[PDB]
Amino acid sequence: IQASEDVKEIFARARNGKYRLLKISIENEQLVVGSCSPPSDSWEQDYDSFVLPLLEDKQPCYVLFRLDSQNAQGYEWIFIAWSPDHSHVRQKMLYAATRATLKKEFGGGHIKDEVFGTVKEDVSLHGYKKYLL
Template identity: 35%
Template sequence: MAVHDDCKLRFLELKAKRTYRSIVFKIEEKQKEVIVEKLGDPEQSYEDFAASLPADECRYAVYDFDFVTAENCQKSRIFFIAWSPDTSRVRSKMIYASSKDRFKRELDGIQVELQATDPTEIGLDVIKSRAS
C-alpha cells in the first residue's frame, strides 16, 4: 500500500506547526494508496473529531490531544487511531489491518496508538486515561 506524500506533509504540519487538530486518512483501494480524507481545524473538539469517523467504514486517524497533568502542566499527545467498526466490510478490515504498521511508520512522532471497533473504545475518557 502506497502512502500519498500529502499524508506525511499534513502530519508534519499537525506535529510541528499545529495547523490541524486531527487528520482522517482513507485507503483508496483502486489506487492502492492511503490519502488524506479530512483535516480538522485547531479549534475542533474531540467529540467533533470522533463524530467525523464513518460508522461503517474503516479509517486511520491522527488526533493531537491537549491535556493538563495532575501537576498542572499543559501537555499534548499525538494519538494514532485505527478505526475498524464491526459493521465495515471484512475485506476493508483486512486491508486496513495489514497496512497499518507500514502506514504508521511513515508518520514519525505518534505517541499513543488505539485500535477501535466502536465509539466507546475511543471515548474521551479512554483518550484521557491513555494520554497521561
C-alpha cells in the same frame, strides 16, 4: 501502499501544529487524507468536538489526533484505528495490515498512544481515557 508526497506535506503541516487531527483512509492502494481540522481549544475539548463525527458505521479509517504535549521530536499524537464490526472483512484486514505502514510514513516517534475500536465508545474521549488506564 504508501503516502504520496502531497500527503506527507499535510503530515508536516499537521506536526507543525497547523492541524489538530487528520483522518486517513485507504483509497485505491493509497493512504489519503480524508479530513482535517485546525486546533481550537485544549486537546480534550478538541477531541470531543472533532473525533466522533469522522467515524463511518460500516467503514474503517484511521484518525491521527494531536495532543498539546511534546516529546523530543515535537507534538505527541494518538493513533486511532477505527474498524467497525459492520465493516467488510476485506476492509478490516486491509486497515489492520496497513496500520504499521501509516505509522512509518507519519513517523513512529511522534506516536504516543495507539487506540483501537470497533464501536464509537471505544474511541470516544472517555474511551481514550479508559485506555490510558
